Amino acid sequence: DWAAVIPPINLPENSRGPFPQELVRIRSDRDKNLSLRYSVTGPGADQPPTGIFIINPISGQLSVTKPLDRELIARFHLRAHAVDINGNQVENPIDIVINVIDMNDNRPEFLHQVWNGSVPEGSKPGTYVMTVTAIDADDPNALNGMLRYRILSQAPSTPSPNMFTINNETGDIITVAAGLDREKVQQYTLIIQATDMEGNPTYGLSNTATAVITVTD
Amino acid sequence: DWAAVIPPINLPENSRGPFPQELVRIRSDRDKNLSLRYSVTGPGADQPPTGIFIINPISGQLSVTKPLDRELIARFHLRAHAVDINGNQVENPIDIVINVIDMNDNRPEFLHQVWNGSVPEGSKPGTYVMTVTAIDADDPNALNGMLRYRILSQAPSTPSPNMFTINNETGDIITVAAGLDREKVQQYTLIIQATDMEGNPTYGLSNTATAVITVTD
Numbered sequence: 001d002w003a004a005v006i007p008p009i010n011l012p013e014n015s016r017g018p019f020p021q022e023l024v025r026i027r028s029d030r031d032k033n034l035s036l037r038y039s040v041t042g043p044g045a046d047q048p049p050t051g052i053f054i055i056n057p058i059s060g061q062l063s064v065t066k067p068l069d070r071e072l073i074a075r076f077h078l079r080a081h082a083v084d085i086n087g088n089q090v091e092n093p094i095d096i097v098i099n100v101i102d103m104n105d106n107r108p109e110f111l112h113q114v115w116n117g118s119v120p121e122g123s124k125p126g127t128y129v130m131t132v133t134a135i136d137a138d139d140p141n142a143l144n145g146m147l148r149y150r151i152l153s154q155a156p157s158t159p160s161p162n163m164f165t166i167n168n169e170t171g172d173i174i175t176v177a178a179g180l181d182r183e184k185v186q187q188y189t190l191i192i193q194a195t196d197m198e199g200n201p202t203y204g205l206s207n208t209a210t211a212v213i214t215v216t217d
Numbered sequence: 218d219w220a221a222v223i224p225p226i227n228l229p230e231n232s233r234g235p236f237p238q239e240l241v242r243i244r245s246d247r248d249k250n251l252s253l254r255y256s257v258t259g260p261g262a263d264q265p266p267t268g269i270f271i272i273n274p275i276s277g278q279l280s281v282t283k284p285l286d287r288e289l290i291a292r293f294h295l296r297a298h299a300v301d302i303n304g305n306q307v308e309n310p311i312d313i314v315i316n317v318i319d320m321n322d323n324r325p326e327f328l329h330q331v332w333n334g335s336v337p338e339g340s341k342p343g344t345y346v347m348t349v350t351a352i353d354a355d356d357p358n359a360l361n362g363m364l365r366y367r368i369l370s371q372a373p374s375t376p377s378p379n380m381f382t383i384n385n386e387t388g389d390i391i392t393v394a395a396g397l398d399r400e401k402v403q404q405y406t407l408i409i410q411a412t413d414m415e416g417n418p419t420y421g422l423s424n425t426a427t428a429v430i431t432v433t434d
């Protein structure tokens with residue numbers, strides 16, 4: 001006989017259900033000669049938040065009761081129990097782990113709308129200027145939460161239309177052209193764009209912020 | 218002992234892994250007195266597409282080896298096998314279903330960039346004119362593939378800047394104002410927008426097309 005294994009139960013967040021929705025049905029094969037009742041415990045069940053996951057005490061059917069939000073809780077570790085009439089467990093508790101599958105339901109947001117940095121005159125190419133980054137509430141290990149950066153605009157456009165670059169993963173802005181001269185421009189304004197889905201422009205979500213770089217003496 | 222039918226296993230499309238990624242560990246309880254080898258069969262394993270799901274022949278650990286795409290294959294039906302070293306079946310094959318969970322990785326697309334329709338002069342409010350629609354490659358039963366429409370603009374702006382409306386669920390363009398007069402204007406140009414996630418404005422994906430409506434005599 002194959003040995004009972006519960007797989008990870010992966011549920012997408014923001015389910016429309018309808019609810020309750022069946023997940024797994026467990027039972028003890030000791031029920032052939034003993035009378036059992038089943039229960040679930042843990043955060044999601046009997047610990048806060050309570051009642052997201054419930055089990056039918058007679059059938060051992062496990063269910064979800066409402067939509068989930070990975071951004072509140074991404075993982076539930078439940079334990080299911082089989083007990084006799086004395087109230088004693090007749091099986092080792094079984095682990096039921098629930099992973100909430102991430103949806104891309106969060107746009108990138110910048111901590112500040114305006115970021116200030118400076119860079120000295122005559123700085124050589126590759127000179128570090130500043131870091132601007134955004135945050136995406138989605139899962140950083142999924143595409144939904146993986147951010148890429150770029151410069152959409154630089155003003156003014158002299159002596160070179162691309163005085164800077166930004167590291168697409170880290171948000172480090174470094175100079176790439178020479179000719180930084182306070183007598184000619186004292187402040188460059190860059191528009192920074194963050195977009196998720198690893199910067200995919202066609203199905204990624206994006207946002208923008210601005211970086212003001214002062215050229216110092 | 219616990220007893221439980223393995224439920225369908227849900228995996229998100231476009232997983233970043235890393236790979237290989239463990240899904241379940243299956244085993245026969247006959248391995249306590251026999252030395253067993255495990256295997257998987259079905260499209261996704263040993264049939265095309267090949268090598269997506271693999272099992273360790275000694276441990277019975279099942280794994281994914283690469284990202285999935287709901288838009289290519291949405292479901293895998295696998296069978297897992299237990300044999301002794303003589304090559305003899307020691308268990309009935311077990312069915313393993315894998316559901317590929319839909320991500321919003323597809324932008325709405327209109328069938329045409331330009332849609333042509335007409336409406337007669339002096340048509341009363343509520344006159345159906347035409348239907349313009351888009352398609353979304355994602356699951357039409359999830360938010361990712363559920364579309365809403367709206368009118369972004371109307372040109373020219375007379376006699377009213379809103380001569381029409383569009384059914385948000387359906388793409389049906391209907392007149393809502395009177396004063397349709399070919400002598401004064403023969404054509405209105407509308408920009409129509411489709412956006413998914415049921416038209417969610419902060420994280421829904423959008424696209425546009427134009428409707429040219431001719432006023433007939």
Ligand SMILES: [Ca+2]
Nearest residue numbers: 069070071105
């Ligand atoms: Ca969420």
Ligand SMILES: [Ca+2]
Nearest residue numbers: 102103105138
């Ligand atoms: Ca999310």
Ligand SMILES: [Ca+2]
Nearest residue numbers: 106138144196
């Ligand atoms: Ca996101």
Ligand SMILES: [Ca+2]
Nearest residue numbers: 286287288322
């Ligand atoms: Ca896809």
Ligand SMILES: [Ca+2]
Nearest residue numbers: 319320322355
């Ligand atoms: Ca999809």
Ligand SMILES: [Ca+2]
Nearest residue numbers: 323355361413
């Ligand atoms: Ca979509």
